[PDB]
Amino acid sequence: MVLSEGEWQLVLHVWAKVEADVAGHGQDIYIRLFKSHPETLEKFDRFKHLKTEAEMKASEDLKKQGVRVLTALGAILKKKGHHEAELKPLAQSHATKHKIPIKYLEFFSEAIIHVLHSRHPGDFGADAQGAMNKALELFRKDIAAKYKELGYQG
Numbered sequence: 764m765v766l767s768e769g770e771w772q773l774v775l776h777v778w779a780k781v782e783a784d785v786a787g788h789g790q791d792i793y794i795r796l797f798k799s800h801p802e803t804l805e806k807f808d809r810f811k812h813l814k815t816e817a818e819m820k821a822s823e824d825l826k827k828q829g830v831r832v833l834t835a836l837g838a839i840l841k842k843k844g845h846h847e848a849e850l851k852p853l854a855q856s857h858a859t860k861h862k863i864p865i866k867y868l869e870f871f872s873e874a875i876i877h878v879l880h881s882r883h884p885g886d887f888g889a890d891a892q893g894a895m896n897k898a899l900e901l902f903r904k905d906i907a908a909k910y911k912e913l914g915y916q917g
């Protein structure tokens with residue numbers, strides 16, 4: 764699969780808004796993920812103790828984690844599909860250390876889309892959401908292929 768330049772521009776234009784406050788967006792995305800799919804929280808040794816949205820919002824380490832994750836994803840999106848080098852260390856760590864199944868990456872993608880739809884109706888109409896879906900699908904497809912090379916069915 765290949766996104767058009769126009770599709771990449773829809774992705775990058777909503778990402779520009781995320782970058783006004785990446786920390787706030789990261790909190791919202793993690794909170795949505797953990798509420799919609801509580802099982803995902805179990806993968807985080809450092810965060811699995813958090814009991815409520817209030818506790819999640821108050822967690823400085825969770826905030827920092829959200830910034831790290833969204834910055835790494837942003838770097839990937841800015842490559843517009845040319846992300847082989849960026850994907851290698853992520854695929855290895857998530858396959859082998861963190862043990863994150865592709866289904867959890869799907870849940871995370873769903874959380875991103877939900878938050879962008881909520882926060883950014885001005886840059887996340889139907890065409891833009893379709894472009895972001897395509898970009899995240901591409902990312903997951905490429906991660907899944909690397910998972911397989913790395914010896915992880917996940």
Ligand code: HEM
Pocket residue numbers: 803804806807808809828831832833835836852853856857861863867868871
């Ligand atoms: C776009 C998708 C994702 C990106 C770009 C991403 C990125 C990152 C980065 C950059 C790190 C720190 C470096 C590393 O260990 O590789 C990390 C750590 C981690 N990731 Fe992900 N991640 C994604 C999805 C997920 C999902 C869906 C889960 C679980 C449901 C997950 C679980 C973890 C865990 C448990 C750590 C270690 C956290 C800690 O240090 O406390 N990741 N991720």
Ligand SMILES: [Xe]
Pocket residue numbers: 788789790792793828829830832833
């Ligand atoms: Xe996040």
Ligand SMILES: [Xe]
Pocket residue numbers: 853854857906
């Ligand atoms: Xe990942």
Ligand SMILES: [Xe]
Pocket residue numbers: 868869871872899902903
């Ligand atoms: Xe993703």
